[PDB]
From a paper:
The genome of Mtb encodes 13 mycobacterial membrane protein large (MmpL) transporters. These membrane proteins belong to a subfamily of the resistance-nodulation cell division (RND) superfamily of transporters and are critical for mycobacterial physiology and pathogenesis, with several of these transporters involved in the export of fatty acids and lipid components to the cell envelope. According to the protein sequence alignment with MmpL3, it is speculated that both MmpL4 and MmpL5 are proton motive force (PMF)-dependent transporters that function via a proton/substrate antiport mechanism.
The cryo-EM structure of MmpL5 embedded in LMNG detergent micelles was solved to a nominal resolution of 3.00 Å. The cryo-EM structure of MmpL5 is nearly identical to that of MmpL4. Superimposition of these 2 structures gives rise to an RMSD of 0.9 Å (for 681 Cα atoms). However, cryo-EM densities for the majority of residues making up the periplasmic subdomain PD3 are missing, similar to what was seen with MmpL4. Autodock Vina suggests that MmpL5 binds Mbt in the transmembrane pocket and periplasmic cavity with affinities of −7.9 and −8.0 kcal/mol, which correspond to KDs of 1.6 and 1.3 μm, respectively.
Author numbering: 22 to 494, 693 to 945
């Protein structure tokens, strides 16, 4: 009277294993490697409706210069002040850049014209910079290719002695970030596998069992990689560095956890005295639903990213869910098949300890005897991490999160050695009318607008037609001058319908004060256009500061939406499986409390020890994984409690603690260490995400699963399983 599903998985184990291996091999061989697919299918990091991107694109369209939103700055640095040779080299480089229309779309030559030459040259005179609008939006593969082409054009040429060109900028930073993440993914995988091997040898103390678990992990990881790369290659969805790295790490960790659960339950059945066939059937009956529910929870939590606004999270959503589904399918079908096939030979999967752990029994007895005090202590420990909130802050520049030898970092270092960050991050503001503004009164009004913008606090320079370098030059004889005509061509649209101001903020515009300055600039422009024929003009404001403001707004909204959706979906899944509202609520609440400790530990590790503030993407990525895995562990505990409750509530809790003590502890340690192994990446954002998830899962395994959940269960008693009667 064996159930049909485990019987089928056991009788046809060899065909199932062969089919899984063949499918995974086909997926990997037919389509290129995941790194190449991610490079080809990289997506822009800014939403198409972002105000900054729209403003920059509108400026490009109006002036008939470009249709992109990505600009890289080429900085010429010299050991001696630049002169005739440097100018000739710069002119040749500009001509070559303009020749390559495939990648370069516009070159804002300001050092060339004597009208704005002083603006583009450093105070010491040993350096200069030129902005280049390149094809493709920041982040996508076309932008990376354009950055590489610009860098090749600038560096690979005959340069004057002591003069070097560096291609810095936000687009270059994103390209180098993607390159570093893709490069470090291999090292992440290697270190993760080494850590997993060490942990498995420690847990099982058997080389054969470790090899079996490693084989299952390799199968699951390879399947997830193959399907993700296959779908990405055929343009089903976009991919990012974070998406690929998290797919790989989560696949490895989830496969290892599922294998640990199955093998631990099988070995517990063996220790109970059941034969190998009966042990396998007991293992399946006791862990198949738990593994399926845990995988569905992880997949749904990851899929919740798909309903965000920022392109990175949204593009990360679907691939993670698909990969988790593949890992679960492999674990529930190839898992038991491998276990049966292996256990049919010698003393392979038979346990070596053949003894119980008095520590877990003692912990269970203590938790049952004194639930209130243990619960209070666990809650206090979880909420201690809230102390990191007052000191918590984030930065948006990615220079800190990349290695110094990175070309973008070298360019930024040279620029900051010779220029200020405000100049390297100018803010563009276009005022567009439906008439021609090439009349002296309109120029007076434009100068008034520029003065209004300068009056705003933290506004260092306002370059425009009336202020080519920020210093004002108005008879028509001024118009008759050729330099004024060139300035009009540079700062006004070909038809004269629009005028663009370049605003350099005092200090650093990439701050909260910078956002306030942006808002005040919009207000000042609106005030200036009042009462003038410019009243109907539309105002667009783009740049690095506006882009980072949009990123901040999107990050906040995405964090809120992701947290809410993940909580609701996980609660629904746990309610469906456990058939108890109170149990699911307890699981979700305990993991939510663990989240605060996770955040506190991560902030303490990175801000106050390493010295690098958490990236603006770490928390939304880490929240879903922490919630899913903590819910899975509490689900294991609750499921075993439901199985053992027939002997009594407290006796059932103690038996659940004993049975699922070592297995879930080993699984949690393995998952936490696999996540923490991402810290080896050169990209520091991925390391922060991995360390945050690892710390959170360590706290959940040590405190939440062991103490908080059993204490809450004991205190609730019969009400823990409401509404179903016990």
């Amino acid at each position: 009277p064996r159930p049909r599903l485990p019987w089928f998985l056991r009788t046809f184990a060899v065909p199932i294993i062969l089919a899984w291996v063949a499918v995974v091999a086909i997926l990997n061989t037919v389509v290129p490697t995941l790194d190449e697919v991610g490079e080809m299918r990289a997506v822009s990091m800014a939403p198409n409706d972002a105000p900054s991107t729209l403003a920059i694109k509108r400026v490009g369209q109006v002036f008939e210069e470009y249709d992109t939103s990505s600009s890289v700055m080429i900085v010429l640095e010299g050991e001696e002040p630049l002169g005739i040779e440097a100018h000739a080299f710069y002119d040749k480089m500009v001509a070559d850049l303009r020749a390559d229309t495939e990648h370069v779309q516009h070159v804002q030559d300001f050092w060339g014209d004597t009208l704005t030459a002083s603006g583009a040259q450093s105070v010491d005179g040993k350096a200069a910079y030129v902005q280049v609008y390149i094809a493709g939006d920041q982040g996508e593969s076309l932008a990376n290719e354009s950055v590489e082409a610009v860098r090749k054009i600038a560096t690979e040429r005959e340069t004057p002695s002591g003069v070097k060109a560096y291609v810095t900028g936000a687009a270059a930073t994103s390209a180098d970030q993607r390159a570093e993440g893709d490069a470090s993914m291999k090292l992440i995988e290697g270190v993760t596998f080494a850590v997993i091997t060490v942990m498995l040898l420690a847990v099982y103390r058997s080389v054969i069992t470790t090899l079996i678990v490693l084989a299952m992990v390799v199968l699951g990881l390879s399947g997830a990689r193959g399907i993700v790369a296959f779908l990405g290659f055929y343009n089903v969805f976009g991919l990012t560095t974070f998406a690929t790295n998290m797919v790989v790490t989560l696949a490895i960790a989830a496969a290892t956890d599922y294998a640990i659960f199955l093998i631990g339950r099988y070995q517990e059945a063996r220790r109970a005295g059941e034969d190998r066939e009966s042990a396998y059937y007991t293992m399946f009956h006791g862990t198949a639903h738990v593994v399926l529910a845990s995988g569905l929870t992880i997949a749904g939590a990851t899929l919740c990213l798909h309903f965000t606004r920022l392109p990175y999270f949204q593009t990360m959503g679907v691939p993670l869910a698909i990969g988790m589904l593949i890992v679960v399918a492999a674990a529930l079908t190839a898992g038991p098949a491998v276990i049966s096939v292996v256990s049919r030979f010698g003393k392979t999967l038979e346990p070596k300890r053949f003894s119980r752990s008095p520590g877990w029994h003692r912990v269970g007895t203590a938790t049952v005897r004194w639930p209130g005090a243990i619960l209070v202590c666990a809650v206090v420990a979880a909420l201690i991490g809230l102390l990191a909130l007052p000191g918590y802050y984030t930065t948006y520049d990615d220079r800190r999160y990349l290695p110094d030898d990175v070309p973008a970092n070298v360019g930024y270092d040279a620029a900051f050695r010779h220029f200020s960050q405000a100049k390297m991050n100018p803010d563009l503001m276009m005022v567009e009318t439906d008439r021609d503004l090439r009349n002296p009164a309109d120029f007076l009004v434009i100068d008034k607008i520029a003065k209004a913008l300068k009056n705003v606090h933290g506004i260092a320079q306002v370059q425009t037609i009336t202020r080519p370098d920020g210093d004002p030059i108005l008879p028509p004889e001024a118009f008759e001058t050729d330099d004024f005509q060139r300035g009009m061509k540079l700062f006004m649209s070909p038809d004269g319908h629009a005028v663009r101001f370049t605003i350099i903020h005092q200090g650093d515009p990439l701050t909260e004060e910078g956002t306030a300055r942006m808002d005040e600039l919009k207000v000042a422009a609106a005030d200036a256009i009042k009462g003038t024929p410019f009243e109907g003009a539309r105002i667009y404001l783009g740049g690095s500061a506006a882009t980072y403001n949009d990123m901040q707004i999107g990050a906040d909204y995405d964090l809120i939406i992701v947290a809410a959706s993940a909580l609701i979906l996980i609660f629904i899944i746990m309610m469906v499986l456990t058939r108890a509202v109170v149990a699911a609520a307890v699981i979700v609440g305990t993991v939510v409390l663990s989240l605060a400790s996770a955040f506190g530990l991560s902030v303490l590790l990175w801000q106050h020890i390493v010295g690098i503030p958490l990236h603006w993407m770490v928390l939304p990525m880490s929240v879903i994984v922490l919630l899913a895995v903590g819910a899975d562990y509490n689900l294991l505990l609750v499921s075993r409690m439901k199985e053992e409750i027939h002997a009594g509530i407290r006796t059932g809790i103690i038996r659940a603690m004993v049975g699922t003590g070592a297995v879930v502890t080993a699984a949690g340690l393995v998952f936490a260490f696999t996540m923490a192994s991402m810290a080896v990446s050169s990209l520091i954002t991925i390391g922060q995400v991995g360390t945050t998830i690892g710390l959170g899962l360590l706290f959940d395994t040590l405190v939440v699963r062991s103490l908080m959940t059993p204490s809450i269960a004991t205190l609730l008693g019969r009400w823990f399983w409401w509404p179903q009667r016990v």
